[PDB]
Every structure is written in C-alpha cells, then in structure tokens.
C-alpha cells in the first residue's frame, strides 16, 4: 500500500496523465490518496510518476495524517478514535490504519473520503523539477522519505 | 533445404499422396467422403468426416475381410471392388450415415474403373452419392464376366491357387445376395 | 561551395542509384595504400584516426586529407616504404543543390559524401615501431582537412 501526493499542477499536463490522477481520486495540488499494490494500480502510478510523490508510510505517520486530514464522505467532522469507533469496523484510528496498510479495507468502504487534503509542506519541499535520486521531491520515496513529506504536510 | 527463404511443400504433398486442390473442392459440399483406394492385391473403401485434429473415419471395408462372408477368389479385380463398396456402404448405413461424395484420390476417372465399381456398390447399399450412370462399367463386367471369357481362352489355367478353372461370376452373385440379407454381421 | 552546407546529417539517406541519375564521379583515387599485397597482421603497430563528431564528409575532403596524409608517408618512407594505410569509407549519400525561387525546389545532383558516426575510425595505418611518429604526423595533417575534431589512436602498440 502506497501513498500518492500530487505535487505538480494540471496546466500543460498530458490529458491522459491528468485523467489517471482523477481516477485515483485526486483533483488538486497537495491532495493525497492510499493505493493497494496491484498490477493494475502499479501501472497507474508509473504513468503519473513525474508529477507525484509516493511510497509506503509507517504505521505512526499514517495515523497522524488520518487523525489530522481524514474526512467523512460528507461534512466537516473530525475523524478521531470516537468517530472511527462509531462508524468503522474498528476500535480506533490505529486499527483502521493497520487494516489499510495490510490492504484489507479502503477509506471508502469505511465511509471516509478517499482523499486526504493536505497542507503545504512546512519548510517547503525539495523541488518539483527533479526526482528523489537527483535531490528532488518527485517519484518513489523511502518510508523515511515519505514520512518526512507527509509529516511536513501535517 | 537451401536456406531460410526456402519453401518446403506440405508433408502429404511431398509424399505424393494428397491432391490439396481437389481435396478443397471435395470438402466444399459439406458431405462426408467415400474414400475409394486400391492396391495391387486389394481394394479399400472408407467414409470420412472432418474433425478438429484430423479426419474421422465412421465406416470402412477391405477386400481382405470380404472372404469373411464367402469369398475364396482374388481380391484385386472388378467383382472384388463392387462388393467391397457395397459392404462399406452397408456398414455406413448402420452408423447413421446417409450421403457421401466420391473421393478417388490420385486415380484416373477412366470409364468403367474399379473406383466407379466401388462407388456403384455404396450406392446400391443405400447411400446418396452424386454420380453418372453412363460412366460406370456394364453390369456384366462387374460380375466378372470379362475374366471368365479370358480363361475361356484357357490353354493354361488362369488362377494359380485353385478356386476353380473357368472361374465363377456366380460366386459374385452368391456374395451379393449374402450381403443384401438384413441379419448379416456388419 | 562550403561544407557548412552539407556537414550535418539533416536529411534522409539518399543512396539509391536506381532512382538518381547523373551522379558525379568520386575524386577518391585509391582506398588501399602502401603495400596492398602484404597483410595487416604483419605489422607491430596499428594506428587509426577516430572521428569525434557524427558528420558527413564530402568526397572532396576525403581526397584532400587522404592525399595530404599519404603524401607525407611517401615523403618520409618512400614510394615503396614499409607501411599500408587504409581509407575504410566510401561516399554513398548523394547531395543536391537548389541552383524559380522556392517553387519546385528539389535540387539537382552535385556530389557525394560519406557519413561517419562519432567514434568510428576513418583511417587505419599499419607500420613498424620506427615509423610510428610519421604516421602520427601524417594524421595530424589529415584531421586538419576535415570538419570534425579527431583522436589519433594507437590500437596495437605498447612499445611507447
């Protein structure tokens, strides 16, 4: 299970690349999503590669982001342990977070919006003109790397 | 053979056994074929249909297992041929087969030949086959008359292995009647 | 005319003589020099001239540089010295020229040129260890008369 974050805008983006982002439920810059690692899903993120940031987040980090940025299918409402408990098949954020990482359920299945709308990266990111290997922020990241980005977009 | 760009004929073409141009025209009818084939000593008749992995033979007869009903004479002749066709034709009617198209392979359509005799037999056995009466030999030559008249010019007995001297087209008649019976093992 | 007009590879391959008529003859007198009866493996040293950029060299340039290099080997080794140089390229690409304005602009045949990819050996000489410095100088003059920069490279020769 990987985490996708849109880091580059739509203007001048190939139409078919932008439509993939929309199929993966992301419509704006700084919007995140969780995707199971399958042959099909893997094809979609490779195509989006040069406009996103992805990787496998740690149990904790995911919990923090879920705590802070997750939302229900409708309305504001804080998604906390109590909320999770009264609406999900779990007991707390952690139970949800564990099931996600293990690809046992989805945010939709539990009645939550598929998208985590993040805040801009505190202290700024590593640039959107180069991949991670060249000192940038685009492409596949480490678990440490993805956590760094997601925790900054707390 | 000579190189990469070289063309090697289909196997049954190298073997000089199948006329593919005639075979196709044969298959276009949609009906099963009546495979009329001869040998120096024998004759053969098969009823073949098309199948996913190769032809399926639904019925057949050989001039050898002819004697099984009464034969005691040569098998590479006219009387032999007709009777083998009728035999095969009857086993066919038994399998639920109703019609066929004559397939003579690499033989020639000479009037009054053995492949035609084979064909007449199967028609007599009750099979619906496209033919032309005035191409089939006259009834007497089928019986083995032409051969009796040959030994009529005796001097030196025609048949080595004794079956008789003047030979018997009557044996042919005995055999035809034996097969026309309904009980007979097929 | 200037080589600036034909040095780059910016057109399709135009070599089919079955559709091109009136192609000028090549100015390249000979491709095999020195002692053609002797073998290449019969020499201790072997130095080739390597082209550094991917370019097109007209037959006029091939003749001029081949000439001015071999002319040196003949001057320093003699009309029958012990060596053998090789121009391993032949001019296949046919050249046009629009010599009315831009109306019906397909040009007429004016020449021929050899296409050489960067890293390929244009010339290759074979000589003994003594004459090794002459072949280098002959090549120095040769790369002075062709478009690209060149590397004089000694292949089999650890007698340096």
């Amino acid at each position: 299970m990987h985490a996708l974050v849109q880091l580059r805008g739509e203007v001048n983006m190939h139409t078919d690349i932008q439509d993939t982002l929309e199929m993966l439920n992301i419509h704006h810059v700084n919007h995140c999503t969780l995707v199971p690692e399958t042959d099909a899903y893997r094809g979609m993120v490779a195509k989006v590669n040069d406009f996103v940031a992805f990787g496998e987040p740690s149990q904790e980090t995911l919990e923090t982001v879920l705590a802070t940025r997750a939302e229900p299918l409708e309305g504001d409402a804080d998604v906390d342990d109590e909320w999770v408990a009264e609406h999900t098949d779990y007991d707390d954020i952690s139970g949800l977070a564990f099931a996600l990482l293990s690809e046992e359920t989805t945010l939709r299945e539990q009645g939550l919006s598929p998208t985590l709308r993040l805040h801009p990266p505190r202290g700024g990111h590593d640039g959107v003109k180069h991949p991670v290997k060249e000192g940038g922020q685009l492409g596949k990241h480490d678990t440490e790397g993805i956590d760094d980005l997601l925790e900054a977009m707390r | 053979a000579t190189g990469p760009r070289y063309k090697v004929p289909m196997r049954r073409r190298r073997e000089a056994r199948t006329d593919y141009h005639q075979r196709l025209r044969l298959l276009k009818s949609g009906k099963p074929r009546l495979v009329a084939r001869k040998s120096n000593k024998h004759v053969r008749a098969q009823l073949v249909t098309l199948g996913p992995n190769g032809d399926d033979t639904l019925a057949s007869a050989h001039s050898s297992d002819l004697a099984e009903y009464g034969w005691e004479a040569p098998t590479g002749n006219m009387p032999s041929a007709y009777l083998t066709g009728l035999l095969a034709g009857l086993r066919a009617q038994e399998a639920g087969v109703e019609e066929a198209v004559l397939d003579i392979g690499l033989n020639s359509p000479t009037p009054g030949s053995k492949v035609f005799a084979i064909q007449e037999g199967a028609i007599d056995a009750g099979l619906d086959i496209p033919h032309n009466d005035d191409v089939l030999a006259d009834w007497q030559r089928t019986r083995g008359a032409h051969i009796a008249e040959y030994d009529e010019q005796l001097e030196e007995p025609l048949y080595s292995g004794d079956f008789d001297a003047a030979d018997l087209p009557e044996h042919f008649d005995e055999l035809r009647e034996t097969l026309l019976d309904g009980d007979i093992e097929l | 005319k200037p080589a600036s007009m034909y040095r780059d590879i910016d057109k399709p391959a135009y070599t089919r003589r079955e559709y091109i008529t009136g192609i000028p003859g090549s100015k390249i007198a000979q491709h095999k020099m020195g002692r053609k009866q002797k073998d290449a493996d019969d020499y201790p040293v072997q130095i080739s001239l390597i082209v550094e950029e991917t370019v097109q060299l007209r037959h006029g340039s091939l003749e001029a540089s081949r000439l001015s290099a071999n002319r040196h080997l003949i001057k320093e080794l003699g009309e029958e010295g012990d060596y053998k140089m090789t121009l391993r390229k032949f001019p296949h690409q046919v050249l046009r020229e629009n010599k009315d304005g831009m109306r019906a602009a397909f040009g007429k045949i004016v020449g021929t040129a050899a296409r050489v990819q960067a890293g390929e050996q244009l010339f290759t000489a074979y000589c003994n260890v003594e004459d090794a410095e002459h072949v280098k100088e002959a090549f120095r003059r040769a790369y002075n008369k062709i478009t690209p920069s060149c590397r004089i490279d000694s292949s089999p020769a650890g007698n340096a």
Partner: protein, 140 residues
C-alpha cells in the same frame, strides 16, 4: 540381390532433327511403329519465327521393338568412353539414344507416391558399358 539390380533397356529414341517432315516415311520403316512431329519454342534468325510448327520426328521403342532395332543399330556405330551419360546412357549418330536402368524404376515414373531413384540404386557409366558390351560388341 543381383536380379533386382541388373541393367535393362527402358527405351530407344530414334530421331531426325531436320528444320522444317518428309523424312517420317523412312523412320517408321526402320523401326516398325508410327512417328511423331517435333515443334519448337522461341524466335530464330534462320527463318524460324513460327513457334508451333513441324521440324522433326521421333519413335520411342520399348521391349522387343527396342532390342530388335538395336540388333542392327549398334553394329552401325563405334562406341566410346566419353560417349556415355553420367546416369549410364549414350547417344550416337540421324541420332539413336538408349536409356538404361535397373528394375525398380516404375517408382519414379508412376503417379501415386512417386519418388526419385536414390543415387546408389542408379545406373553408372561403367555399369552401362559392361552390360551393353556384354551384348554383341566392344567398348571404348
């Protein structure tokens, strides 16, 4: 093995290459059977522009007709070494050709399951001279 390996005469082709025929009359009386016309292909400067038209005649002799004829033809010629085919044939002269080969030849001349005769079972230049010289005359 030897019986089904011993040489025989397949045919003797007697032919007269003329150029435009009136020679048929004699070619039949020398052999015994009917002759056949001979046409041509391609245009020729020697006034031979008409493709299909009479030029020569021939007669292919088989069995008795062949030997009986040879019992007069052979004596009329002088056999030589080079005068022999690689397959074991020979021509001399009006021309007279003799095709020889062993028993299992029908295999290559029949229609069904026909096959080319193996190089081994084929007659040889030497095997020919022998068999023929062994029939009323001398070799080289």
């Amino acid at each position: 093995f030897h019986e089904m390996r011993e040489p025989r005469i397949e045919k003797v082709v007697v032919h007269m290459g003329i150029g435009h025929a009136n020679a048929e009359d004699i070619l039949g009386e020398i052999t015994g059977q009917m002759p056949v016309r001979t046409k041509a292909k391609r245009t020729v400067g020697e006034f031979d522009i008409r493709e299909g038209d009479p030029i020569g005649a021939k007669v292919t002799l088989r069995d008795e007709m062949a030997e009986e004829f040879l019992q007069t033809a052979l004596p009329l010629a002088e056999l030589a070494t080079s005068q022999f085919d690689d397959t074991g044939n020979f021509s001399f002269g009006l021309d007279v050709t003799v095709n020889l080969v062993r028993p299992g030849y029908r295999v290559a001349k029949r229609d069904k399951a026909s096959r080319s005769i193996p190089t081994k079972h084929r007659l040889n230049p030497a095997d020919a001279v022998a068999f023929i010289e062994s029939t009323y005359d001398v070799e080289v």
